[PDB]
Structures are given as C-alpha cells and as structure tokens.
Amino acid sequence: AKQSMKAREVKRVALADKYFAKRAELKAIISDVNASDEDRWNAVLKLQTLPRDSSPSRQRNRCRQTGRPHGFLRKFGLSRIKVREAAMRGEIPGLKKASW
C-alpha cells in the first residue's frame, strides 16, 4: 500500500481506541429494549455525528510490514507473501511446510 494509506489506517485505529467506550455506550443504549425511544434516537444521532474513522468496522486489516489490504492473516498480522517470507527464514515460530 501507499504510505498515505498506512497513515490513514493508523489514524482510524487511533480514533477507534479513543471513541471505543463513547460509541460502545451509545450502541448499548440503542440496543436496550427496555429504554426510551427519544433517548435511543438521540444516541443514534450522537453515533452518526461521531467521526466515522472511529468505527471499528471502517478499519481494513493491513499487513503490518507492507500495508497490503488483502491476503491477510490475523495469527501473524501480515500479508500472505510476507508470512511466506518469514516462514522460510524461520522468523515465525512453530510455522512449517505442512503435509498430510
């Protein structure tokens, strides 16, 4: 990916970290069946207002070396290619060419 893309991702991550609780509460309120309608509406409005980059579903899991927006693996936090590179070198622990 571009440096710019990476930066954006970082920013998004930061925002999520910041607003997690603030937005989480709102979400909870919205969910609440035994709660006021107006209150719920207000909560929703607040959520809408909040910066979108603070939403965790607006984060694309990039490779932590390259920034690749695809071929991702959460075990490693890397692009497939990068994992392969690491794997060959011995830099991922326990990982080895599997056969069965």
Binding site: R84, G94, L95, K96, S99
Partner: peptide, 8 residues
C-alpha cells in the same frame, strides 16, 4: 500455494 501449520 504454500500450506503451513503451527502444531501447538
């Protein structure tokens, strides 16, 4: 493809 594994 490469099919790797981590035997824990």
């Amino acid at each position: 493809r490469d099919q790797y594994e981590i035997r824990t």
